[PDB]
Design an enzyme around this catalytic site. Sequence first.
Site, mmCIF file in Angstrom:
data_model
loop_
_atom_site.group_PDB
_atom_site.id
_atom_site.type_symbol
_atom_site.label_atom_id
_atom_site.label_comp_id
_atom_site.label_asym_id
_atom_site.label_seq_id
_atom_site.Cartn_x
_atom_site.Cartn_y
_atom_site.Cartn_z
ATOM 1 N N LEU A 138 -3.411 1.252 -2.213
ATOM 2 C CA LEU A 138 -2.249 2.098 -2.218
ATOM 3 C C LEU A 138 -1.959 2.476 -0.764
ATOM 4 C CD1 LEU A 138 -0.112 3.629 -3.920
ATOM 5 C CD2 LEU A 138 -1.664 5.579 -3.977
ATOM 6 N N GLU A 195 -9.205 7.685 -2.718
ATOM 7 C CA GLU A 195 -8.726 8.275 -1.479
ATOM 8 C C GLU A 195 -9.855 8.928 -0.730
ATOM 9 O OE1 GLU A 195 -5.293 10.610 -3.361
ATOM 10 O OE2 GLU A 195 -4.600 10.219 -1.442
ATOM 11 N N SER A 222 -6.409 4.680 4.909
ATOM 12 C CA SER A 222 -5.390 4.138 5.760
ATOM 13 C C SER A 222 -5.550 2.628 5.854
ATOM 14 C CB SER A 222 -5.435 4.809 7.141
ATOM 15 O OG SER A 222 -4.429 4.341 7.964
ATOM 16 N N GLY A 241 0.148 3.723 2.607
ATOM 17 C CA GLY A 241 1.033 4.735 3.073
ATOM 18 C C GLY A 241 1.971 4.254 4.159
ATOM 19 N N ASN A 242 1.745 4.725 5.359
ATOM 20 C CA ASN A 242 2.703 4.571 6.430
ATOM 21 C C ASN A 242 3.040 3.115 6.703
ATOM 22 O OD1 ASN A 242 4.233 5.429 8.810
ATOM 23 N ND2 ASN A 242 2.623 4.548 9.954
ATOM 24 N N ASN A 289 3.264 3.265 -1.256
ATOM 25 C CA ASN A 289 3.627 4.637 -1.464
ATOM 26 C C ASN A 289 4.454 5.079 -0.271
ATOM 27 O OD1 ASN A 289 3.807 7.329 -1.964
ATOM 28 N ND2 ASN A 289 1.678 7.795 -1.853
ATOM 29 N N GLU A 297 -2.178 14.630 -1.894
ATOM 30 C CA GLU A 297 -1.142 15.505 -1.421
ATOM 31 C C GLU A 297 -0.628 16.460 -2.492
ATOM 32 O OE1 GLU A 297 1.357 12.599 0.312
ATOM 33 O OE2 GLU A 297 -0.044 12.243 1.860
ATOM 34 N N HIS A 332 -2.289 12.258 -6.597
ATOM 35 C CA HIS A 332 -2.358 11.992 -5.182
ATOM 36 C C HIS A 332 -2.902 13.231 -4.453
ATOM 37 C CE1 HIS A 332 -1.216 10.935 -1.064
ATOM 38 N NE2 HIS A 332 -1.276 9.690 -1.467
ATOM 39 N N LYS A 383 6.010 7.737 -0.069
ATOM 40 C CA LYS A 383 5.969 9.183 0.062
ATOM 41 C C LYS A 383 7.394 9.713 0.215
ATOM 42 C CE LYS A 383 1.360 8.957 2.102
ATOM 43 N NZ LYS A 383 0.259 9.594 2.848
#
Lengths: 246, 244
Positions: free
Chosen positions: A228, A164, A209, A230-231, A9, A96, A94, A11
Amino acid sequence: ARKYFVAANWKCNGTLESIKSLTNSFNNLDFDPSKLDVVVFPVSVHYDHTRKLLQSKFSTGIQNVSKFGNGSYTGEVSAEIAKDLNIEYVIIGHSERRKYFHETDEDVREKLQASLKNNLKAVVCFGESLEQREQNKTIEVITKQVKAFVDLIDNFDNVILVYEPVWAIGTKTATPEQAQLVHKEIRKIVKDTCGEKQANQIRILYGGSVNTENCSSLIQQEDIDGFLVGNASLKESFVDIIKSAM
Amino acid sequence: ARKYFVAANWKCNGTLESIKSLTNSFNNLDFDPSKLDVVVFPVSVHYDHTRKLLQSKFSTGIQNVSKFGNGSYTGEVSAEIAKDLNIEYVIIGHSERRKYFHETDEDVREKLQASLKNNLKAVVCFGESLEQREQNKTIEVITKQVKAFVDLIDNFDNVILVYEPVWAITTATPEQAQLVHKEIRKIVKDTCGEKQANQIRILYGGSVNTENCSSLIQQEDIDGFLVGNASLKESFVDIIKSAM
């Protein structure tokens, strides 16, 4: 049994140049898509560039989808449009979007129904707040969140769940054992709501994370079928995360 | 003289195939982009397809933009990203987004700010509800919506206003629309200055079609339109002609 699933993702990040560089690095990894699912979710306007650049061993999707069909919904991308473009996957719910955009369980349900109608595969996110966790409501919250949409699922290969740990978003973090415990409970919920075979096929991803350091420890858990990410997915070392699932 | 501006809001509509035929038909219209602005706003995933297919005389844009920058905002498109892609225009504050997605006046203000910061050109929408109109609040509402963002405008060619008679979405007569438009221009003058108010384009965002388009554009203070369903049709070229 279950085919492992590793998702990036991205983002709201990227430039044309950064993507070219990253996809290039990603293309160097030789994995077998018959054995592992690896999915990249670029920004909508980056989708064409990203899809063209990535080798087809990489699956692709978008980070959100409309709850409405085609029509007078300025700014939305319908599931019919995604299907026409051959966009394989969508992310739904999500944390977010739920936070910033006030997405509800009802919206999640609608988006899922729309995606399935149009033969899209869905990666559906949920998880509990810090306060809900503090008050020992995790199972109650998750059960409600899952039950919001779960009855819609007909093919248990084509819907993928993501836990999540919103309570973590920093600050943090769940131990791999702690995630596993939640994932096991989620599977029980599917088993009792849908059926045992169904609960046994569905993929359940960890959506906390994830990084090169913890991925192996996470994937090793019995009920954790992938991530899934992220960064860390914005980095060339994301290939190492994929490797953990190979 | 203000340069007329005709916009196609395709909304959530299209396929690769349909766009291919539609863009070809549009390309057949011989117009001079220095004399009018014609902007096409496809769905986001359709942007590259559309931009490729349309000849350069046509400008392009997207239907919405994030108020947040790059970062952890899943599903959003940043102004920075749009800039990197040379996406020229964005639509902000469309009544549909206000209705379905709860976008506020503050959201509109922040979105415009992100857009200008990133050198995007903005087509900004507002308008009153049926209840508001019925309650004779149209000016109060419009003044409030416009004053939410108007002070941010730093270049009066680069921001375009659109009046949506949401009340009538179940029309406004051209004469009714003209009065609202003039009122909008007066708010801009009051806040931004006279020269600035004279410069800015104000578009009618009610239902526009090949029949009514001339009647609207010929009004003194209506500078063009943000067109909906009619923009999905080959005859959209006739709408453009009303501005030529």
